[PDB]
Structure formats: C-alpha cells, structure tokens
C-alpha cells in the first residue's frame, strides 16, 4: 500500500531522528544561544546561514550538511542578487520546507534530519528572535521560546519549559540549558550564539576556555 509505504518511510525518519543526538536553541537576553552536544571537533551541528541567521539540525550529519550548504549558496545568491538585508530566515525556512517535502516525496530515501531555523533582530534594531523548526516531511513549526532537536525531546523539553526564563542572561541561559540537557562535560559540546549586538554577523561560537570560564 502507498499508505503503508509512507508509514514505513515516516517511521524510518522518526527512528533516525530519535536515535540521534540532541540540540537545543533558546532565545535569551543576548539573542539566540545554540547548544548542541558534540564530542567530535571536526563534525559541527551548529553553523551560520546569514549575518543574523544561524543553522541547527538533528539527524544524519551528511544530510543536513549538504542541506546547510545548499541553503548557504541560496542565501548568498539572494543577498547578492537583491540586497544583503533582503535575506530573511522565513524565506530560508520556506525553501528548506519545500525541498524537504520534495526529498520526502520523490527521493526514494527520506532524510532522517529535523532542522531549526533561527533569525534575530538586525544590529541597532529591536525584533524578537524567530525560531522555525522543520521536520523531514517539511512540517515547519514556529516556536517563540525554545526549539529542541532530536533525542528524548520530552524530558529536556519539560525541564526547559519549567526553567525557561525570557531575556535570560547568557550564563543563566547556559546553566538552565545544560541542566535540562543532562536529563555533559565541558567536552562533547558545541555552543554558538546569534548575538544581535554583532554589527553584521550575529553568529558566534563559545568553546573551550570561554566555555569553561562561562561554566
């Protein structure tokens, strides 16, 4: 049955994403703080898509790696084609949802990845951080507070919900996030921030000595 084929495909993607590492991105005082546990130094699960747009994902690394790449060429082409400020995270999330639906529909092998799209206010401008979670079939959801990628999202999501504070400072947001995520060490982690106080490129990483002192 086509219905049972779609069921096994969707459950395959579900098993892939659930049997995958966890990423949490939260809106805090300084913008968006990206928290993903990452033992591998070479492999990166957080990245920048645009000056005020970052990248987060949960699933097969090559899948969302190629997807992130393609989105990066698309965003650069849009910025150069019209203007740098004319690129928004909403349009990027729309393109990602469309192409994820395309891959789910015609590509025989679904991607077992589930992505989060983040956009912050431009520098010298006020606007609440925007979070777009897109899953394999393109089902995009807008979260105003927090977006959890992969893994046992329920205990971590409940812990975050109980301990989420709007405009939380970076230290407090980090400690809340790590307490929720334990439900690790300084290693096996990846920390990135979309800082609205950045003049152009909001994205920035915090690792090692900065991460250690922050903890």
């Amino acid at each position: 049955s086509p219905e049972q084929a779609m069921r096994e495909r969707s459950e395959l993607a579900r098993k892939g994403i659930a049997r995958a590492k966890s990423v949490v991105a939260l809106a805090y005082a300084g913008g968006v703080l990206f928290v993903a546990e990452n033992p591998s130094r070479s492999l990166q699960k957080i990245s920048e898509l645009y000056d005020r747009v970052g990248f987060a994902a949960a699933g097969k690394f090559n899948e969302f790696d190629n997807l992130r790449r393609g989105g990066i060429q698309f965003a650069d082409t849009r910025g150069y084609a019209y203007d740098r400020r004319d690129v928004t995270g909403r349009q990027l999330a729309n393109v990602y949802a469309q192409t994820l639906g395309t891959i789910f529909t015609e590509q025989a092998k679904p991607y077992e990845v589930e992505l989060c799209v983040a956009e912050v206010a431009h520098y010298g401008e006020t606007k609440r951080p925007e979070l777009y979670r897109i899953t394999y079939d393109g089902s995009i959801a807008d979260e105003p507070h927090f977006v959890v990628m992969g893994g046992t999202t329920e205990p971590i999501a409940n812990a975050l919900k109980e301990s989420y504070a709007e405009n939380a400072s970076l230290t407090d947001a980090l400690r809340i996030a790590v307490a929720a995520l334990r439900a690790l060490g300084v290693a096996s982690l990846e920390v990135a921030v979309l800082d609205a106080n950045r003049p152009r490129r909001a994205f920035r990483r915090i690792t090692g000595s900065a991460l250690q002192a922050l903890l």
Binding site: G16, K21, N38, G59, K60, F61, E63
Partner: peptide, 4 residues
C-alpha cells in the same frame, strides 16, 4: 549513519 552519522548522527553527529
């Protein structure tokens, strides 16, 4: 699989 990658899952990383």
């Amino acid at each position: 699989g990658q899952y990383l």
